[PDB]
Each structure stands twice: as structure tokens, then as C-alpha cells.
Ligand binder design. Structure first.
Ligand SMILES: Nc1ncnc2c1ncn2[C@@H]1O[C@H](COP(=O)(O)OP(=O)(O)OP(=O)(O)O)[C@@H](O)[C@H]1O
Ligand SMILES: [K+]
Ligand SMILES: [K+]
Ligand SMILES: [K+]
Ligand SMILES: [K+]
Ligand SMILES: [K+]
Ligand SMILES: [K+]
Ligand SMILES: [K+]
Ligand SMILES: [K+]
Ligand SMILES: [K+]
Ligand SMILES: [Mg+2]
Ligand SMILES: [Mg+2]
Ligand SMILES: [Mg+2]
Ligand SMILES: [Mg+2]
Ligand SMILES: [Mg+2]
Ligand SMILES: [Mg+2]
Ligand SMILES: [Mg+2]
Ligand SMILES: [Mg+2]
Ligand SMILES: [Mg+2]
Lengths: 402, 124, 50, 119
RNA sequence: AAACUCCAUAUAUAUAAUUUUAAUUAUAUAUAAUUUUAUAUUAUUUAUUAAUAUAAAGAAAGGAAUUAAGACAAAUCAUAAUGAUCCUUAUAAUAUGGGUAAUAGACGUGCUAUAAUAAAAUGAUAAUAAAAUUAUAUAAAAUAUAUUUAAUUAUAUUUAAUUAAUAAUAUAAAACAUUUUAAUUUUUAAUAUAUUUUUUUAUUAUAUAUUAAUAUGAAUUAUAAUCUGAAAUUCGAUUAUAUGAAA
């Protein structure tokens, strides 16, 4: 075939994401991220711990187009105005419902990854929805459940449930004994033809057993409702529910799915949409008081009046067409008392630290190291990045060969 | 007599110059600062998507090695991204001469004080 | 201080020549993106200055 | 290969696109309605379909005017033009453009396809 | 003749009670370059010089028009006008319909296309223009239908503002970002797996044909509806569903 086992056949964005190009990167020894000792890592570039990397890879915290392949493992600058400020509010605020905003490429996803790293350290169960477009684009199966009166998506739910199991500590999941008895249809290819159903008795089985139930696609919606109910009734372990690229949900009210009348299906008629908005609105209350809900927008999505109105940044305009203003989402967001945290741009001292790390990583071109004064480089790269934009900073250093 | 009056900083320490390229025009306000730039009230990376356009704006400050010594408030209208970015470049160079008239020769030698005359020509 | 500093170069002559040879229809931004992305892939496999 | 009403389809083909490609009388809008009616998700592919679902597509396709029936309607409308002696009917008989196109040049496609027994 | 000019460009003054706002502008007048100077080198008719570089000053880099002679007895009697010659119940005048749109071959000039350095979607506190047009008008917003939550596109209903640096035609487009893309088993799916998770790896299924026409291409054609007009048959434009040729 034209494609060999190691040939780079994908496009550039997928090749950089998937071609394992970090293997040639130089190993550097950086401090480890620990919010309990932030005083020693504030305003310094840190790597994550081995326990944090395993969890964040299973959650989808690291994404393509983040120049992660430049370094052995993804790294983050512990910032005072973004990382330390946000994590302190998360530990102190009583509501603990946040939506992270800011200009495209400002570092909203990295901040969410730092909140996931904090949760891993602080013995919390993280439920992350990295790419909500996957359950709204109409590229996986859907089915209507009569008992739930919702459109369930078995293919997507199978992937999501495994992520919740592989990304979270088994010990935490095992601690949560079940509160009710559950029965599902057995799809385990070993005893499916011997045991018609698999029963999970209360006080004996745990939420770890519930996350390992192999059921038929038509009964997988009832398995997702049990998992969420069990995690929302227990008060032992805090639950951190996160959704990256939440702007996609706010701006795509109607999924690509069509019902039997060729009518597009409202996103809140999908179980994923209903479940997501039940946790955000407060309908699904978590017994533990350290449970949080951190949402993040993305600049790849279109903008409209939905989010600004929900956040109180602009007045409500009733004559705005529904395609640019969804009043039902505004009601849900304001019922949950979601608060905004705008990620600030980098200051010149933070740019200095990042460029000093890049120099030690050997990612800087020879035109920025030889014959150029260090102070000139920092001033030039702070100007060419829009006065702080981390993504424009990296592009000016590694993706500007002019 | 002559028609030239010495240029001086205004009441707020700002040097105001105008520049033109193609159909674009730019009026910049240069003051001593720390390298903050605003284009039509928007961040530089927002208004100008092309890094080559951003590099053109920075070039006059790079010639006098004063990229982190001034705050620029640039207002531009007409033409496209290239005309506006280079019109701002031309206007910053003309506004920097007030802060130190001894650097005019270096600015002229770099070519940032020369108004680019090229414009769309109706075919003849 | 400036009298002994050479005026910084506006552009790289070689890269500008290569870019214009790639470019067609005046789409310089696409041409610069292709070259920059290609040179980024060279660095990530050789770990030297592309 | 998935066979629906004789037509053969490669497994990877998207159902809504394949139906509007191999079946005469079914276009993009009509194909989407068939998939919506049968509960097939927008970008489902042929290899995913089960035999019960393949039979459901054939049933819905057999309750529509497609293939011969649709082609016969066009052949009978063209024949009626010739029967009444209208100017348009003569153009179909002479293998000439029927919609006002000039014939001093071009008119090659009308010469190959315009006919009373139009394909 | 060239120049002197005019335009563009740079600058100055004047004008605007800076809500006709673009003062980053408008348009009147004036100034500026056919640039200037210093030094070294190489040539010279060697001097008070050219070619060169170097340094300095400068915003300075582009255009138009600008008339005399002759030729092809080159085009035009179909823009209008003249002589000669011919018609004068017709070679003049009016009306209805038809033709100028015919179709074997050939030629000129264009448009669209034959896919991945390129096509398609989407981008609302709305990325970024210029030059024009509107009293024999330009038509906003809204509503209704196609038609679906909405948007988009088309038309209808209604006719706001403006006869204009004011309102309208009109939120420029490409760009850029995301998604998608046949040929392509380079895919997709089912299980398991991962410290690549929008993803990796493993095992199964995912077609056959195939130098070839697809989810490229949009010719041809069916049906329905709409726009202008008194009238759309020969012979107009647009939309929807279906058709989907050559390349
Ligand atoms: N604190 C940080 N330390 C190091 N790199 C950072 C930091 N914050 C952001 N970056 C880098 O900046 C770029 C953009 O980061 P990120 O993807 O988090 O931005 P974003 O605002 O979420 O982007 P989008 O709007 O596309 O969703 C990446 O290359 C990322 O690695
Ligand atoms: K068809
Ligand atoms: K004709
Ligand atoms: K021809
Ligand atoms: K004004
Ligand atoms: K006629
Ligand atoms: K194409
Ligand atoms: K415009
Ligand atoms: K074809
Ligand atoms: K007609
Ligand atoms: Mg992000
Ligand atoms: Mg003749
Ligand atoms: Mg003619
Ligand atoms: Mg705009
Ligand atoms: Mg309107
Ligand atoms: Mg726009
Ligand atoms: Mg576009
Ligand atoms: Mg097509
Ligand atoms: Mg062929």
C-alpha cells in the first residue's frame, strides 16, 4: 500500500498531535505542580505529577494545537493572577460554580487542566466532558428511551463511562457504597447467555462495580442515570464536573439529530444535554459541599448574546432571534448561580519566565538567541503576542519563519 | 519664511503622527510606556491576524531598540490589513522622532520614514 | 549607543524568496503557513534550528 | 457490500449520500427524510446497517416513485409533447435543444440525450 | 519639440459653531525635486569630469496631456451631413404576426470545470475597502410562505428613511479559525487497551468492479411556483423537487 507503518499520512494538525514528536525532546527537571505548596512554584514553569498525568490523559485535559509535542510532557506556568487566583476561589466560594472565559488562546483549557490536577491531588472524582460537539454533531448512534423520555446515545456513553473509571482513583470509587439496588441487562460476552441480568445490591457493591457494568446499548442510558444519582447522593467524595468548550453547547441548541418527523432534536431532549444542564442549573444537587462545576468556553465556537446575558454583562434584548439568543439556557445558568472568571493575559514578567523555559527546552530559533539582547527579545515577544496572549507567544517563537 | 514649526509632545506627553499606505490611513498616539499597544481599541493579536503585519508595526521601534519604552494607541481606517499595518508603521516612525530627533537619520536609513507611493493603477 | 548597532534586517531574504515561490494568486499568508508548518515539523524531528 | 433493492453499496458509504446517488428519483432532501424516518443517525454508514434495517429501507423505497416508475413519468410526459404536436415535442424528436438554447454553436449534449425515449 | 503645465504624493494657510463627522475628513490657495552635497575608486577629452560605491539632507518613488508631415485613394453614405444617379400607388408611410435566436462542418473571444499548496459548510456586542448610484427612484426593519426552533436563500405583504458628506442599494469578499471532504483498508464499526484520550495500539468485519467520474463536475431534461411586461409560443430571468452528460 502507499501508506507504510510509519509514514506520516495525516494532515499537519493531526500529525503534530498524533505522530509522537515529543520523543526527541530533551528531558528537563522541573518542579512538580502542588497547590498545597504553591508558594514554592508560583510564577514558575512546572510539570505535573505522574498521578496527575495519568488522570489528565484519560480526561482529555490536553488537546491538539497546544504545542505539547515541543516538550517531553505538557507543562504549565503556575500563575498568580490566573492559576492561584482561580484555585483560591474554588476552595473558598460556597457555590463553586464557575465558567472560565477570556480571549481565544488566553489559556482557558490549561487553567481547567490545572483545576483537574488540583482535584486529583485533593482526592476528588472528576467527570470531564472535553468535546461536547461529539454528542451534538450526529456522528454516533442515538435511541429514544421511553422510561427516561430522552434520546440516549449508547456509543458516546460507553466512552464517557470508561473515562470516569480510568481517570479517577479506584479507591475513591470503591469507598462509595451503593444506595439502591440496580438491575441491568447483561452484555458481558462470557456469561451473557447464562445470566440474563446483572444485579448490584446496596451496601455490598460500590460505584466502582457500577462503572464496570457491561449492558446492552438500549439500557446504557439507565446506567448513566444511576452513576450520576449515586455520585450526587453520596457525601464522602467531592465530585468535580467539568465541561470544556461549553460555548458549543450554548450556541448549538438543536443537535444534528432528526426525529421520525425529520425535525431536528433540541439539545435538552438528549440525555447528555439534559444531564449536563441539570448539574449546572442545580437540579442535580451533590451532597458533598466541596463538589464543583467548572465550565470553560473556547474561541473556536461562534459567539452570541446567550452567554453575555447569562453572565450579566449585557441587558436582555427580547427581539433577538433564537439563533443568537437562547432564553432557556440563560435561565438554567442563572438558576445555578454560575460565576465568571476571566483568564487575564500574561504580564511581561510572566513572558520572561516562559521564554526562559523555552530557551532551556531548546525550542528557540538561533535568530532570537545569537546577536539579540535578552531584554530586547522579551520586549519584542511581548509586543508580537498582543501583550500577553500565550498562544500568540508560542507561534511567534516556533511558528514564525519569515 | 519657512512653513515648518518644531514638533513637540502635547499636554499629555503624546506624539501624534499620521501615516498612509495604499488607501489606508493611520493616526497613532505614542507616549512613554511599557510596550502596550491598542489598535482601534482592540488587542493587536485580535485586530491583525497575520504575524507579518504585527512585525511590520514593531519594526520602527525595533530600529531604535525601544520596543518596551512606549505605549502606542493606533487608530486606522480604510484599505485592508496590509495597508493599515504599514500605515501604522509609517506613523509610528514619524512620531518617534519627537522623542529623540537624533535618531531620524537611523529611521530614514531603515526606510520607515519614506511614504510608500504605490497604489492601484487603472490600466492604461 | 545606537551608532554601533546595525539596523535590524526587515526580512530574511532566503525565506522570503522561498515563500513567494510557494505563493500563488497573492495568497502569501497560506504560503507562509505552509513553510512555517513544514519547518516546525523539521525541528520536531531533528531538534535543530530548521 | 450492502445490497438494497439490487443496488450495491460499499460499506463505508454514508447512507444518506448513497441513497441519493444510486436511486433514480431520490436526492439529498429525500434521502435525509428516509433516514430520519427509519431512525438512522445522520452520518451512519452502510456497513453498520443490520438485515432488519436493510429491509426497512427497501420497504420505504418500495412505497415511493423511483427507478422505472419515475423514469416512466418523464418518458410519458415527453411522449405527450410529441402527441399533441407542440413545438417542444418536435425538438425532442429532432434531438435539438428544447429550452431556447442557440444551435449555431454548441448544442452537443442535446444532440446526444434529447430523444422521445429519454433515458 | 522639450519644457511650462495638470494629476498623484509631502507640507503650509483658510473654511467646518467636529450631530450631513469620515477632522484618520472634505476642497480652495500656496510651496516642494528635472533632487542636493561630501568623500574614495575606476575610466576619461584626467578636469571645476563621468561611471561606481560610501556618508549626509530630504516625504519624494509614478503618471497624463503636450504637435508637424505623409501614407495605406485603410473603416464609416448604418452616428448625422453633401454631389451625382435611381424609386415617386412606392425602393416612401402605418398596423398585425414572423425573422434577426435556423444548424452539417469550420474559426475568434469568453465562462465553468476536470479535488487535498483546495473545494464545501459555520463564524452577531457583527475582522478589514474603494469608487459609484438613487424625482423616467434607491428601498430599510418587520411579517408571511417555501420551511424546519432559528438562521440562511427566494418571493410576497407592507413602503421607514433619503432625492442625499445625513437615509437606502450595502454587515465587502478573499483572508483567518473550526468542521468536513470521494479516489483512500490513509476509512468506519464492535470489543479490549493506553501517561497520544477530538487520540494510540491490538484482533475481527468494512466489496466488487475498476483507467477509472465521486460526496468532483453541472450540461441536458421532467414537473411545480415566482418576477418584469398589455403580452414570455417561436424567444427572457429566478426558485424548489427530480434529472446528473462531457470533462
Ligand atoms: N499557564 C500556561 N503555561 C504554559 N503554556 C500556557 C499556559 N496557558 C496557556 N498556554 C499555552 O497557550 C496556548 C493556548 O492555551 P489554551 O489551549 O489553554 O487556550 P484557550 O484559551 O483554552 O484556547 P481556545 O480559545 O482555542 O479554546 C497553548 O499553546 C498552551 O500550551
Ligand atoms: K439520485
Ligand atoms: K434557437
Ligand atoms: K464557437
Ligand atoms: K469628527
Ligand atoms: K423577434
Ligand atoms: K476542488
Ligand atoms: K463594504
Ligand atoms: K459522476
Ligand atoms: K417564452
Ligand atoms: Mg481551549
Ligand atoms: Mg466597405
Ligand atoms: Mg445577431
Ligand atoms: Mg465590521
Ligand atoms: Mg428586509
Ligand atoms: Mg463579517
Ligand atoms: Mg467564506
Ligand atoms: Mg456537487
Ligand atoms: Mg470519460
Amino acid at each position: 500500500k502507499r501508506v507504510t507503518p510509519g509514514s506520516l499520512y495525516k494532515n499537519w494538525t493531526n500529525t503534530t498531535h498524533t505522530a509522537q514528536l515529543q520523543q526527541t525532546a530533551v528531558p528537563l527537571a522541573l518542579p512538580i505542580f502542588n497547590f498545597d505548596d504553591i508558594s514554592k512554584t508560583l510564577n514558575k514553569v512546572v510539570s505535573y505529577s505522574n498521578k496527575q498525568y495519568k488522570s489528565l490523559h484519560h480526561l482529555g485535559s490536553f488537546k491538539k494545537s497546544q504545542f505539547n509535542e515541543l516538550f517531553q510532557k505538557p507543562v504549565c506556568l503556575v500563575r498568580e493572577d490566573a492559576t492561584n487566583s482561580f484555585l483560591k476561589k474554588l476552595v473558598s466560594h460556597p457555590v463553586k460554580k464557575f465558567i472560565i472565559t477570556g480571549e481565544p488562546g488566553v489559556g482557558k483549557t490549561v487553567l481547567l487542566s490545572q483545576a483537574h490536577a488540583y482535584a486529583v491531588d485533593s482526592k476528588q472524582i472528576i467527570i470531564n466532558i472535553s468535546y461536547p460537539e461529539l454528542f451534538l454533531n450526529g456522528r454516533n448512534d442515538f435511541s429514544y428511551d421511553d422510561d427516561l423520555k430522552l434520546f440516549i446515545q449508547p456509543m458516546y456513553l460507553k466512552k464517557l463511562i470508561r473515562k470516569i473509571l480510568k481517570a479517577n482513583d479506584p479507591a475513591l470509587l470503591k469507598s462509595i457504597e451503593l444506595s439502591k439496588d440496580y438491575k441491568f441487562s447483561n452484555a458481558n460476552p462470557k456469561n451473557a447467555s447464562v445470566k440474563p441480568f446483572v444485579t448490584l445490591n446496596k451496601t455490598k457493591n460500590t460505584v466502582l462495580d457500577l462503572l464496570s457494568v457491561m449492558t446492552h446499548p438500549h439500557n446504557r442510558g439507565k446506567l448513566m442515570k444511576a452513576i450520576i444519582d449515586e455520585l450526587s447522593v453520596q457525601s464522602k467524595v467531592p465530585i468535580m464536573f467539568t465541561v470544556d468548550n461549553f460555548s458549543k453547547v450554548l450556541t448549538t441548541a438543536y443537535s444534528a439529530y432528526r426525529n421520525t418527523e425529520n425535525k431536528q432534536i433540541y439539545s435538552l431532549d438528549l440525555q447528555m444535554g439534559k444531564l449536563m444542564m441539570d448539574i449546572i442549573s442545580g437540579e442535580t444537587k451533590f451532597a458533598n459541599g466541596e463538589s464543583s462545576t467548572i465550565l470553560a468556553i473556547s474561541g473556536v465556537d461562534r459567539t452570541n448574546k446567550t452567554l453575555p446575558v447569562a453572565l450579566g454583562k449585557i441587558p436582555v434584548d427580547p427581539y433577538v432571534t433564537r439563533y443568537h439568543y437562547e432564553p432557556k439556557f440563560v435561565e438554567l445558568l442563572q438558576k445555578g448561580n454560575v460565576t465568571e472568571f476571566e483568564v487575564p493575559k500574561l504580564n511581561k514578567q510572566e513572558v520572561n519566565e516562559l521564554i526562559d523555559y523555552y530557551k532551556q527546552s531548546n525550542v528557540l530559533l538561533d535568530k532570537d538567541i545569537t546577536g539579540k539582547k535578552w531584554e530586547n527579545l522579551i520586549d519584542e515577544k511581548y509586543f508580537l503576542s498582543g501583550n500577553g496572549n500565550p498562544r500568540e507567544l508560542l507561534k511567534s517563537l516556533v511558528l514564525s519563519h519569515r | 519664511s519657512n512653513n515648518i514649526k518644531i514638533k513637540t509632545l502635547d499636554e499629555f506627553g503624546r506624539s501624534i503622527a499620521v501615516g498612509k499606505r495604499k488607501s489606508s490611513t493611520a493616526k497613532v498616539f505614542v507616549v512613554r510606556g511599557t510596550g502596550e499597544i491598542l489598535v482601534n481599541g482592540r488587542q493587536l493579536n485580535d485586530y491583525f491576524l497575520k504575524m507579518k503585519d504585527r512585525e511590520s508595526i514593531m519594526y520602527p521601534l525595533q530600529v531604535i531598540e525601544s520596543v518596551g519604552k512606549y505605549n502606542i494607541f493606533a487608530t486606522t481606517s480604510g484599505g485592508g490589513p496590509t495597508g493599515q499595518a504599514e500605515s501604522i508603521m509609517h506613523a509610528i516612525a514619524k512620531a518617534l522622532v519627537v522623542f529623540n530627533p537624533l535618531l531620524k537619520s537611523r529611521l530614514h536609513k531603515a526606510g520607515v520614514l519614506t511614504r510608500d507611493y504605490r497604489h492601484v493603477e487603472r490600466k492604461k | 549607543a545606537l551608532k554601533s548597532v546595525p539596523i535590524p534586517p526587515r526580512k530574511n531574504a532566503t525565506l522570503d524568496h522561498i515563500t513567494n515561490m510557494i505563493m500563488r494568486h497573492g495568497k502569501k499568508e497560506k504560503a507562509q503557513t505552509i513553510l512555517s508548518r513544514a519547518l516546525y515539523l523539521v525541528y520536531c524531528q531533528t531538534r535543530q534550528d530548521p | 457490500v450492502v445490497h438494497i433493492l439490487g443496488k450495491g453499496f460499499k460499506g463505508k458509504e454514508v447512507i444518506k449520500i448513497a441513497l441519493a446517488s444510486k436511486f433514480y428519483g431520490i436526492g439529498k432532501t429525500t434521502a435525509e427524510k428516509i433516514c430520519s424516518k427509519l431512525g438512522l443517525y445522520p452520518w451512519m454508514r452502510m456497513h453498520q446497517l443490520s438485515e432488519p434495517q436493510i429491509m426497512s429501507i427497501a420497504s420505504e423505497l418500495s412505497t415511493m416513485t423511483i427507478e422505472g416508475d419515475a423514469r416512466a413519468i418523464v418518458k410519458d410526459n415527453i411522449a405527450l409533447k410529441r402527441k399533441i404536436g407542440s413545438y417542444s415535442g418536435m425538438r425532442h424528436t429532432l434531438h435539438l435543444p428544447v429550452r431556447g438554447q442557440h444551435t449555431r454553436n454548441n448544442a452537443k449534449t442535446a444532440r446526444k440525450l434529447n430523444k422521445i425515449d429519454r433515458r
